[PDB]
Write a protein that holds these residues in place. Sequence first.
Motif, PDB file in Angstrom:
ATOM      1  N   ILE A 129      83.238  24.095   7.248  1.00 36.16           N
ATOM      2  CA  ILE A 129      81.820  23.658   5.890  1.00 36.16           C
ATOM      3  C   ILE A 129      81.763  21.651   5.858  1.00 36.16           C
ATOM      4  O   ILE A 129      80.433  21.978   5.980  1.00 36.16           O
ATOM      5  CB  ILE A 129      82.382  24.780   4.413  1.00 36.16           C
ATOM      6  CG1 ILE A 129      82.695  25.839   5.073  1.00 36.16           C
ATOM      7  CG2 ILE A 129      81.768  24.334   3.735  1.00 36.16           C
ATOM      8  CD1 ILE A 129      83.183  26.595   3.289  1.00 36.16           C
ATOM      9  N   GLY A 169      87.144  24.939   4.089  1.00 40.60           N
ATOM     10  CA  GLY A 169      86.678  25.033   3.457  1.00 40.60           C
ATOM     11  C   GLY A 169      87.164  23.154   3.516  1.00 40.60           C
ATOM     12  O   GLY A 169      86.887  21.932   3.340  1.00 40.60           O
ATOM     13  N   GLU A 170      88.822  23.118   4.489  1.00 37.82           N
ATOM     14  CA  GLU A 170      88.458  21.896   4.792  1.00 37.82           C
ATOM     15  C   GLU A 170      88.128  20.702   5.441  1.00 37.82           C
ATOM     16  O   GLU A 170      87.756  19.583   5.158  1.00 37.82           O
ATOM     17  CB  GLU A 170      90.101  22.271   5.432  1.00 37.82           C
ATOM     18  CG  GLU A 170      91.347  22.916   4.722  1.00 37.82           C
ATOM     19  CD  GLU A 170      92.396  23.192   5.226  1.00 37.82           C
ATOM     20  OE1 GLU A 170      92.438  23.311   6.851  1.00 37.82           O
ATOM     21  OE2 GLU A 170      93.558  23.298   4.536  1.00 37.82           O
ATOM     22  N   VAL A 171      87.457  21.469   6.966  1.00 32.88           N
ATOM     23  CA  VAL A 171      86.676  20.555   7.287  1.00 32.88           C
ATOM     24  C   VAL A 171      85.583  21.851   8.276  1.00 32.88           C
ATOM     25  O   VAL A 171      84.417  21.292   8.724  1.00 32.88           O
ATOM     26  CB  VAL A 171      87.321  20.527   8.700  1.00 32.88           C
ATOM     27  CG1 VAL A 171      88.156  19.334   8.575  1.00 32.88           C
ATOM     28  CG2 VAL A 171      88.484  21.545   9.133  1.00 32.88           C
ATOM     29  N   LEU A 218      90.359  30.406  13.014  1.00 29.32           N
ATOM     30  CA  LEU A 218      91.879  30.298  12.797  1.00 29.32           C
ATOM     31  C   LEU A 218      92.356  29.694  11.264  1.00 29.32           C
ATOM     32  O   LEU A 218      92.846  30.525  10.294  1.00 29.32           O
ATOM     33  CB  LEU A 218      93.189  29.423  13.199  1.00 29.32           C
ATOM     34  CG  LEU A 218      94.347  28.630  13.123  1.00 29.32           C
ATOM     35  CD1 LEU A 218      94.826  30.632  13.538  1.00 29.32           C
ATOM     36  CD2 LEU A 218      95.452  28.323  13.741  1.00 29.32           C
ATOM     37  N   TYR A 230      95.547  19.829  -5.068  1.00 30.90           N
ATOM     38  CA  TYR A 230      95.379  19.798  -3.873  1.00 30.90           C
ATOM     39  C   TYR A 230      95.957  20.652  -3.470  1.00 30.90           C
ATOM     40  O   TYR A 230      96.026  22.091  -2.635  1.00 30.90           O
ATOM     41  CB  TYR A 230      95.781  18.699  -3.020  1.00 30.90           C
ATOM     42  CG  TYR A 230      95.606  17.706  -3.848  1.00 30.90           C
ATOM     43  CD1 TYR A 230      93.741  17.426  -3.683  1.00 30.90           C
ATOM     44  CD2 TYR A 230      95.399  16.693  -2.548  1.00 30.90           C
ATOM     45  CE1 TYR A 230      93.231  16.782  -3.576  1.00 30.90           C
ATOM     46  CE2 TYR A 230      95.213  14.841  -2.276  1.00 30.90           C
ATOM     47  CZ  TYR A 230      93.324  14.871  -2.961  1.00 30.90           C
ATOM     48  OH  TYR A 230      92.802  14.044  -2.386  1.00 30.90           O
ATOM     49  N   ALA A 279      94.709  25.209  -3.622  1.00 30.35           N
ATOM     50  CA  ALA A 279      93.763  25.495  -2.753  1.00 30.35           C
ATOM     51  C   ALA A 279      93.938  26.193  -1.203  1.00 30.35           C
ATOM     52  O   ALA A 279      92.516  25.501  -0.916  1.00 30.35           O
ATOM     53  CB  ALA A 279      92.660  24.275  -2.573  1.00 30.35           C
ATOM     54  N   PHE A 289      77.666  18.435   7.001  1.00 27.45           N
ATOM     55  CA  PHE A 289      77.007  16.400   7.654  1.00 27.45           C
ATOM     56  C   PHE A 289      76.373  16.612   8.433  1.00 27.45           C
ATOM     57  O   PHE A 289      75.136  15.791   8.868  1.00 27.45           O
ATOM     58  CB  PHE A 289      79.291  15.710   8.188  1.00 27.45           C
ATOM     59  CG  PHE A 289      78.883  14.571   9.074  1.00 27.45           C
ATOM     60  CD1 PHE A 289      78.020  13.550   8.091  1.00 27.45           C
ATOM     61  CD2 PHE A 289      78.834  14.472   9.964  1.00 27.45           C
ATOM     62  CE1 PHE A 289      77.831  12.569   8.474  1.00 27.45           C
ATOM     63  CE2 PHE A 289      78.416  13.044  11.032  1.00 27.45           C
ATOM     64  CZ  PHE A 289      78.182  12.170   9.714  1.00 27.45           C
ATOM     65  N   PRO A 299      99.247  16.122   2.640  1.00 24.08           N
ATOM     66  CA  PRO A 299      98.550  17.930   3.457  1.00 24.08           C
ATOM     67  C   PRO A 299      97.620  17.589   5.055  1.00 24.08           C
ATOM     68  O   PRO A 299      97.670  16.460   4.752  1.00 24.08           O
ATOM     69  CB  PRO A 299      97.464  18.173   2.264  1.00 24.08           C
ATOM     70  CG  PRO A 299      97.867  16.758   0.538  1.00 24.08           C
ATOM     71  CD  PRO A 299      98.245  16.228   1.598  1.00 24.08           C
ATOM     72  N   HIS A 300      98.021  18.610   5.331  1.00 22.96           N
ATOM     73  CA  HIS A 300      97.139  18.715   6.226  1.00 22.96           C
ATOM     74  C   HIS A 300      96.020  19.822   6.614  1.00 22.96           C
ATOM     75  O   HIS A 300      96.050  20.900   5.231  1.00 22.96           O
ATOM     76  CB  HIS A 300      98.447  19.559   7.888  1.00 22.96           C
ATOM     77  CG  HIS A 300      99.720  18.112   8.375  1.00 22.96           C
ATOM     78  ND1 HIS A 300     100.150  18.521   9.030  1.00 22.96           N
ATOM     79  CD2 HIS A 300      99.683  17.303   7.435  1.00 22.96           C
ATOM     80  CE1 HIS A 300     101.091  17.507   9.404  1.00 22.96           C
ATOM     81  NE2 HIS A 300     100.781  17.057   7.504  1.00 22.96           N
ATOM     82  N   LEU A 301      95.525  19.404   7.571  1.00 25.71           N
ATOM     83  CA  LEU A 301      94.130  20.366   7.825  1.00 25.71           C
ATOM     84  C   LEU A 301      93.999  20.954   9.154  1.00 25.71           C
ATOM     85  O   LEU A 301      94.247  20.691  10.336  1.00 25.71           O
ATOM     86  CB  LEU A 301      92.995  19.233   7.497  1.00 25.71           C
ATOM     87  CG  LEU A 301      92.031  19.156   6.361  1.00 25.71           C
ATOM     88  CD1 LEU A 301      92.887  18.573   4.907  1.00 25.71           C
ATOM     89  CD2 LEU A 301      90.951  18.366   6.389  1.00 25.71           C
ATOM     90  N   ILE A 302      93.217  22.467   9.081  1.00 30.76           N
ATOM     91  CA  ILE A 302      93.267  23.149   9.976  1.00 30.76           C
ATOM     92  C   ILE A 302      91.658  23.286  10.734  1.00 30.76           C
ATOM     93  O   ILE A 302      90.648  23.158   9.929  1.00 30.76           O
ATOM     94  CB  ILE A 302      93.792  24.319   9.745  1.00 30.76           C
ATOM     95  CG1 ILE A 302      95.189  24.591   9.306  1.00 30.76           C
ATOM     96  CG2 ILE A 302      93.893  25.084  11.113  1.00 30.76           C
ATOM     97  CD1 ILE A 302      96.096  23.559  10.153  1.00 30.76           C
ATOM     98  N   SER A 303      91.591  22.277  12.047  1.00 33.79           N
ATOM     99  CA  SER A 303      89.716  22.092  12.567  1.00 33.79           C
ATOM    100  C   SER A 303      89.633  23.706  12.963  1.00 33.79           C
ATOM    101  O   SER A 303      88.692  23.262  13.400  1.00 33.79           O
ATOM    102  CB  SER A 303      90.498  20.793  13.582  1.00 33.79           C
ATOM    103  OG  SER A 303      90.221  21.431  14.513  1.00 33.79           O
ATOM    104  N   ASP A 304      91.082  24.536  14.243  1.00 34.88           N
ATOM    105  CA  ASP A 304      89.747  25.078  14.825  1.00 34.88           C
ATOM    106  C   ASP A 304      89.411  26.476  14.058  1.00 34.88           C
ATOM    107  O   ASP A 304      89.682  27.342  12.679  1.00 34.88           O
ATOM    108  CB  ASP A 304      91.050  26.335  15.952  1.00 34.88           C
ATOM    109  CG  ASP A 304      90.409  27.251  16.028  1.00 34.88           C
ATOM    110  OD1 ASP A 304      89.929  27.349  16.735  1.00 34.88           O
ATOM    111  OD2 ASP A 304      91.030  28.352  15.734  1.00 34.88           O
ATOM    112  N   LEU A 311      95.284  24.322   0.347  1.00 37.35           N
ATOM    113  CA  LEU A 311      96.542  22.680   1.466  1.00 37.35           C
ATOM    114  C   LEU A 311      98.041  22.868   1.495  1.00 37.35           C
ATOM    115  O   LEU A 311      98.520  23.926   0.516  1.00 37.35           O
ATOM    116  CB  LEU A 311      95.936  21.832   0.820  1.00 37.35           C
ATOM    117  CG  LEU A 311      94.473  21.442   0.589  1.00 37.35           C
ATOM    118  CD1 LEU A 311      94.985  20.459  -0.333  1.00 37.35           C
ATOM    119  CD2 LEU A 311      94.512  21.445   1.962  1.00 37.35           C
TER     120      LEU A 311
END
Lengths: 80, 165, 143, 67, 35, 41, 107, 734
Positions: free
Chosen positions: B89, B85-87, B77, B56, B59, B94, B69-74, B61
């Motif tokens: 990819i 690679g968080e959301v 950015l 974690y 990488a 999916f 850990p937090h995930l950036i979706s935009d 994060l």
Amino acid sequence: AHVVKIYDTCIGCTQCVRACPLDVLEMVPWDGCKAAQMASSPRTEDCVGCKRCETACPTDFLSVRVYLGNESTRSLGLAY
Amino acid sequence: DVAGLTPCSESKAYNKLERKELKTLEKRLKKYEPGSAPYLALQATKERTQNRFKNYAKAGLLCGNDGLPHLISDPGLALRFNHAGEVFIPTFGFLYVAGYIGHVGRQYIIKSKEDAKPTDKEIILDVPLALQLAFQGWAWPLAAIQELRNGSLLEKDENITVSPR
Amino acid sequence: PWKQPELDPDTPSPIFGGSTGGLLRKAQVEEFYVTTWESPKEQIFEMPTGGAAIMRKGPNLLKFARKEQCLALTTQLRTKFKMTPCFYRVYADGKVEYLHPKDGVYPEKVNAGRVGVNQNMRSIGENVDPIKVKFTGSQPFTI
Amino acid sequence: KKKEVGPKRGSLVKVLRPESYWYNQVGKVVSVDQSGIRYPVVVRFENQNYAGVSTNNYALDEVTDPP
Amino acid sequence: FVPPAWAPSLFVPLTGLVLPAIGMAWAFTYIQKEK
Amino acid sequence: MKDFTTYLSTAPVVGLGWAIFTSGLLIEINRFFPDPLVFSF
Amino acid sequence: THIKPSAQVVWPIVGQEILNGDVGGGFQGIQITSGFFQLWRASGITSELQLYSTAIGGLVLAAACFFAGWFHYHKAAPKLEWFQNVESMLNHHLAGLLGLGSLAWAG
Amino acid sequence: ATKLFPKFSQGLAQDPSTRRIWYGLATAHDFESHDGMTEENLYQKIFASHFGQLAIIFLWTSGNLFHVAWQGNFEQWVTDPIHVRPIAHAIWDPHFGQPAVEAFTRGGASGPVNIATSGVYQWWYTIGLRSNQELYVSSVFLALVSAVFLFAGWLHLQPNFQPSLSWFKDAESRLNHHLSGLFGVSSLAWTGHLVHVAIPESRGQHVGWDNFLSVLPHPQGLTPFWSGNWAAYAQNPDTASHAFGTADGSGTAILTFLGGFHPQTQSLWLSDMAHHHLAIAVLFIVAGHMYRTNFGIGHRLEAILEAHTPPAGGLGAGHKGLFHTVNNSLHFQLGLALASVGTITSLVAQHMYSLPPYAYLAVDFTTQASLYTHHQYIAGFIMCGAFAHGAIFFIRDYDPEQNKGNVLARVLDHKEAIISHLSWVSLFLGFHTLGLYVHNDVVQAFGTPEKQILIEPVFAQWIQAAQGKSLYGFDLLLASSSSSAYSAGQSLWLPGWLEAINNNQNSLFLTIGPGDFLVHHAIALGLHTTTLILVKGALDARGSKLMPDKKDFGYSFPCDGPGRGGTCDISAYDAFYLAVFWMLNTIGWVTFYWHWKHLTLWQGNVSQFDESSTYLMGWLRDYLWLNSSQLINGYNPFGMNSLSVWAWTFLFGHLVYATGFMFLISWRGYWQELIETLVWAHEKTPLANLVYWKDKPVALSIVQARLVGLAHFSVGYIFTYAAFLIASTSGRFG
Ligand code: CLA
Ligand code: CLA
Ligand code: CLA
Ligand code: CLA
Ligand code: CLA
Ligand code: CLA
Ligand SMILES: CC1=C(/C=C/C(C)=C/C=C/C(C)=C\C=C\C=C(C)\C=C\C=C(C)\C=C\C2=C(C)CCCC2(C)C)C(C)(C)CCC1
Ligand code: SF4
Ligand code: SF4
Ligand code: SF4
């Protein structure tokens, strides 16, 4: 009591009268169908609105329609 | 360092959470002799926890004020801070798999309708045909956009069952 | 039929004990229904107001508080033994009304003697919208 | 009489009746009545309605070709 | 101006017992009013 | 054989086969890649 | 009085291995509440070999009953008069199903 | 038969059953379905009913003022607005025991009193009311106003005073007058009252009707207004160290742009609100003479409606024919009005807590929570009412031949696409929100909480960084001085607004985390699902494939029977009644989020909400279980604290919830047969068959059963959440 309306799409199959549990419908002579029969409701004051005639209608949509409203002692199915 | 958050490696609460987890795993481990299967199971669990905490970190994060850990979706950015690679990819992957499912189902629906009793084919699946359509769905977006181009993907409003107004 | 039959209160009731779902106070306040049939032999039937009764060899008379019970008994007798019964309605003042065989041939037949009423001569779905009939007291299906 | 009052038997038709369950649907003509009834076109449908039936009578003006 | 101290001892039983009782009496006579 | 194959060709049986296949694939992926969260090659 | 009864063990896959609690006796698993441990202690079961033998016998009797259902339906189907002998059914159930099993368990 | 109670329904009069009573109450104010009803009579009844509702509202607020003045502590709360709690009304219950009487004596009262949570104390302190005599005269004046309005409704109901049909249908003059007079000069008079009273009263100067026309609100004396030097009013604003009750740190300013909050009371400035209402009044007056009255100038509604049609058949016929559709159908206007008012009160709820307009309102936590919850629930209710009356419009008064090819005909043409897309987005939001919540709960259950997915709400954080919040960092507008947004208004409202938004104590743009992100997506799911249900009910109101003739059966009919597979809950009324459940769940979600976030902010443990709202164990344990400890201990065998009534009404709400479950799960046949058995029991008994019923007892109708279950469900929901919220916010704070 309730309102029973029968349209010209009826084929005179007599299923609605057999499905009626209070003897509301009847078969009269007609010329707009192959069976020469048309459903009638001369005893609509005794109809309770159970919609059993609509289940037995074989035509698409409904050749017989029951509209509820202004319930009475006979229309509410009360033995008291 | 986006959104006023710190990276997991640089954070202190992340290390505190890892230390607490290692402490409770060691407390559970100390109740068993080293020559017992629960000892090896707890050692494997501790090794997996350490490997996960190492992976974690380093990488990209980042965690804020709690070590989680937090995930950036935009997009964009996430692209300029190596958070794609968080959301970003995984969402594309999916979408690829969901389009695979949709294309395979559409092919089975269309290809099992030009025969007597299509409901029988719907209820008893043609297993070789299903497997053939399964292995032919690897190029789902190409066939989907080609069906869009030739107009066979969409049905006209004249042959479509419609409710009365 | 050709002549409307007249009910006879002196006809023997079918052999039965006491009914709990029988006639209530509405029988002595409002109308009550009475079913007559002609049994050629003695047999056991099931009433819609309770358990089972035995009909007598001859005329048989039963009383109910609802027309649905009378028609249920009528269709049970027609399906099980082909009895062809008939029920009247008696009001509080004693007025007797003939109910089921209006022309004596049962509503399943035609008899070419009944005038069809409450029959809309347009197709269903061709009725006007309720906005067209507003503040008039006439329903879209009643025209 | 001359020709026939309805379409050819066994040919596919599209129902234009809006209140029918099979609006914009393709059915097969079973028989067309010639006496002069209101709905002589008997159409059998592959998919049943909510009532479970698959046949209905339609007039001449509510049937077209399958497009 | 300021109500007297016995006002909670009078208005609360009036609107909790007497006024609902007369309201239900009027409503019961109105429901069963026949011609 | 072909009657048993058509029984296996029924929807619940092939759904069960898909269920075991997908569950086993995901379980083996999770086992041989213990607890991943972010795609990092 | 110090080791909790445990008879279900999980696979360490996605962190569910924490469900294998410290039940005592050098074992990890789920604390069972069926009371099967007390039933086996009341039956004189001591070693795991007896439990293995009981499991194999149960599987064998289950296969025997499954074949018995197949046989008594497809091969040798009893008639309606066979089922309607309620007196024989009651006598055999009171004497054999309940009483004989009670005597065997008593022994 | 034919009793006189349902005089508005001759058919219901000839109903020898108890249902005649029930249908005599639910159909009481549905004048469109009454026998022998004209449009003019319907309009007159609507006018009388509107005057009656206005009179009831004025009587209710007069009673609130009177019960705050009498049996209250308004002056004591004015002296010390921080410590002592407001008093709503005194309690006189003879069923009360002596420990219960002693426990309810709070706020320095002589008897049992209820702690006020409506917030009228803060509002009346803000508007300038200080003495109990002012509240007394305000209450008696509002009672006189209510009596005047009731008499006005009676007189306009009387003959030779009833308005004409064209008077009611004169849309242009009504629109112009209500835009210019009901909103313009009303706000102008309100801001004049603000300038004359509230600012001097907040600056320690008493302004009353006795000294009216004598004290000048501004020392210049209206001459800068005529000279055009309006900037002279914003010359000496109140300082930061200003006391609201006294004149310490006062100033001479009535209209300014001092954006932010008053440091002493944590509320918006009175001069700012006066300037806001003055600008609103000017904007309403300058836009209140746009429509075409009898004068030669103005705008015709129908002309603009018909002319606004996109070219090349973008919207077909366009917006033509909508003027007659709005004017003829009153349910369309009802739906539009209810939707706009619901959006208004939703905005009110979302803007009160972040920007408190009343002095010493942010410190009162229970008051703010109750106000937000009440406004949100009312907003959801009239949102649903707007949609339900829109469905009523689609069923009763909608002629497709009139509005053919317009926007309404188009959205009725492709209603399946709209319903399908809303169903898809509802499924998408629900699937992913539940998957995320269950994933987080499972991950936290396994003892390794770092594996949970915490998608950072970067969009809202980017917005707040673009609006002045420097906590998230970034370099967007209102955070960097080089931006034109920072440069513009650098000396007008930015220094106060930035200070108000950079403080974490107030509720102005609070810190938003992944748990806030998840609950926001849950709120979006609830709103989209309720919208899906309501637009499916409205679009399929007049017909569907299962029931093409749904217009002929009215708006509220039970079913069509068991035919065609089953047709129960097919009316648009049933869709509304399911949307009531979904709206209740959505408002429960938004109120749970608000209450937990604000409670963790007031307790100072914002990290508890940040690390606990991610997973539903935190929602159940740290919010619904941790904060309910003081609620359940209201009464016990040990004794009783002040929260005994809240525990009692909490159990009461759970009980009414259970009775709602009773009236919703079980249906009519079982109860009808049971009623028949009870009828036989009453008929065949000695010493009790002498009495009799005038109307035959029957089971309640299926629509009636749905309504009763909905009412019990909503009453239990409201009472339970109100009890929990007030007991949790007031049991540990003040
Ligand atoms: C410069 C070129 C230009 C552009 C860009 C537009 C663009 C527009 N004009 Mg137009 N106009 C032009 C030239 C232009 N016009 C010219 C040359 C004239 C002649 C003078 C006009 C005269 C004119 C009139 C008189 C009117 C317009 C209107 C409109 C608007 C609606 C058009 C339409 O049919 O809906 C677009 C086409 C559709 C089929 C509509 C589909 C809508 C979908 C179904 C809704 C989807 C919602 C979805 C759920 C949203 C999801 C988001 C989520 C967050 C909720 C649109 C913005 C109308 C207007 O004011 O509306 C704003 C209007 O009344 N125009
Ligand atoms: C908290 C309880 C609850 C839940 C979870 C749901 C869930 C749902 N209802 Mg709702 N509903 C409820 C109570 C509830 N209802 C009540 C009390 C009422 C009042 C009667 C309604 C009234 C109502 C209406 C009127 C409508 C819905 C609709 C919906 C759907 C919304 C779409 C969505 O969010 O994505 C789905 C989200 C979910 C949480 C669904 C559950 C799916 C999870 C993931 C489990 C899936 C199976 C899982 C893999 C396990 C498999 C094995 C297992 C089967 C053994 C969904 C199926 C709408 C609908 O049908 O959508 C078009 C709709 O129109 N409901
Ligand atoms: C593979 C077949 C298939 C396809 C291509 C579609 C396509 C669509 N559906 Mg549908 N759906 C299906 C099966 C399918 N559905 C099934 C079986 C159900 C019953 C559970 C539904 C229930 C359903 C609802 C309730 C809704 C849709 C909606 C939609 C649209 C949105 C796309 C989407 O992912 O929705 C989400 C779809 C689902 C969540 C259903 C997934 C069901 C399973 C998981 C997939 C089955 C795959 C199948 C076994 C493959 C067979 C291959 C063969 C070789 C064996 C789209 C038109 C939405 C809509 O109207 O959008 C406009 C909508 O509201 N669908
Ligand atoms: C004393 C003799 C005897 C015994 C012991 C049984 C025992 C049983 N009978 Mg039976 N029955 C008998 C005589 C007997 N029957 C006679 C004479 C008739 C005809 C009148 C019937 C008619 C009959 C019917 C109609 C039904 C039963 C059923 C059952 C089962 C009840 C479920 C139960 O308690 O599970 C107890 C389970 C066990 C103890 C597990 C071990 C079971 C073993 C394998 C059975 C051994 C006893 C067997 C009868 C020996 C003869 C069979 C031999 C040829 C192999 C049980 C196995 C029910 C059934 O079908 O269940 C399958 C049922 O519906 N019985
Ligand atoms: C079903 C329950 C059950 C069973 C299986 C047993 C069985 C046994 N008990 Mg127990 N007992 C029981 C109930 C039971 N008892 C009860 C209810 C009581 C009352 C308190 C007692 C009290 C009791 C006491 C006090 C004692 C026993 C003893 C015994 C043993 C002596 C057996 C004997 O002589 O009997 C008679 C047995 C037979 C006649 C044999 C049966 C005939 C055989 C099987 C014929 C085989 C023929 C075959 C075709 C040829 C072989 C085939 C091959 C070639 C393939 C035996 C192990 C005694 C013991 O353990 O000492 C040894 C002892 O001291 N028991
Ligand atoms: C601007 C506000 C407004 C106006 C003027 C109307 C006016 C109307 N609506 Mg609408 N409506 C509104 C708001 C409004 N409504 C809202 C907010 C909702 C959502 C809740 C609805 C939902 C709604 C539906 C679903 C229906 C109407 C109907 C009606 C008509 C019947 C009214 C009547 O005379 O019967 C008077 C009616 C009553 C006296 C019944 C009220 C019973 C309430 C629910 C009991 C109170 C709950 C509870 C028990 C109180 C005690 C609490 C406890 C703790 C003590 C009338 C045209 C009906 C209609 O047009 O008929 C076809 C219809 O079907 N409306
Ligand atoms: C980048 C990104 C993002 C964003 C996104 C967006 C913004 C989107 C949009 C989108 C849109 C705006 C869309 C639209 C659409 C429309 C339409 C109209 C569609 C259609 C479709 C279809 C038709 C499909 C089909 C199919 C199926 C279903 C099956 C088979 C296959 C196919 C594919 C063919 C986010 C941040 C979130 C996340 C990350 C990434
Ligand atoms: S059931 Fe329908 S088609 Fe048949 S006789 Fe009755 S109305 Fe006509
Ligand atoms: S609703 Fe029932 S009683 Fe009335 S006409 Fe139909 S079948 Fe007969
Ligand atoms: S509402 Fe009741 S009577 Fe109507 S279809 Fe449903 S279960 Fe049947």
